[PDB]
Amino acid sequence: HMADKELKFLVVDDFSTMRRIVRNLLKELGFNNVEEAEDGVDALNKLQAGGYGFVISDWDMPNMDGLELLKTIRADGAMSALPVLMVTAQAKKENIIAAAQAGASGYVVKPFTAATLEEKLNKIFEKLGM
Numbered sequence: 001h002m003a004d005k006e007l008k009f010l011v012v013d014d015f016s017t018m019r020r021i022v023r024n025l026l027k028e029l030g031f032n033n034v035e036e037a038e039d040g041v042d043a044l045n046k047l048q049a050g051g052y053g054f055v056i057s058d059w060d061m062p063n064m065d066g067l068e069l070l071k072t073i074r075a076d077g078a079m080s081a082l083p084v085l086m087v088t089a090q091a092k093k094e095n096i097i098a099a100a101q102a103g104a105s106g107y108v109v110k111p112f113t114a115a116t117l118e119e120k121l122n123k124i125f126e127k128l129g130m
């Protein structure tokens, strides 16, 4: 997949407010193909529907947390390469290590600025040649 207007994003967080921030930032950046999920299970249901090129995900969520979500994606043959940007209040170095080692494409700590989201997305786009 490529970082063009068509790139389809999945935004995952148990709080509407945080999903709404991310969706609106993505709109500003020119990405209007954006769906939302409320937890890891919900996310996987939509991912399995097909077509997604990018996941932005919270950590602390009911039913399936974001670290489990990330691990599932990375271990699944059909989506193991999917970009996953963690966007979370979890700020301990050991959280960052766990997510990094699990295969996070990037990691943004809440609260975050519009500029921070943009540059961390762009960093992932460049790393993956999108």
Ligand code: BEF
Pocket (backbone or CB within 6 Å): 058, 059, 060, 061, 087, 088, 089, 090, 110
């Ligand atoms: F709930 Be998240 F991890 F910010």
Ligand SMILES: [Mn+2]
Pocket (backbone or CB within 6 Å): 013, 014, 015, 058, 059, 060, 061
């Ligand atoms: Mn949460």
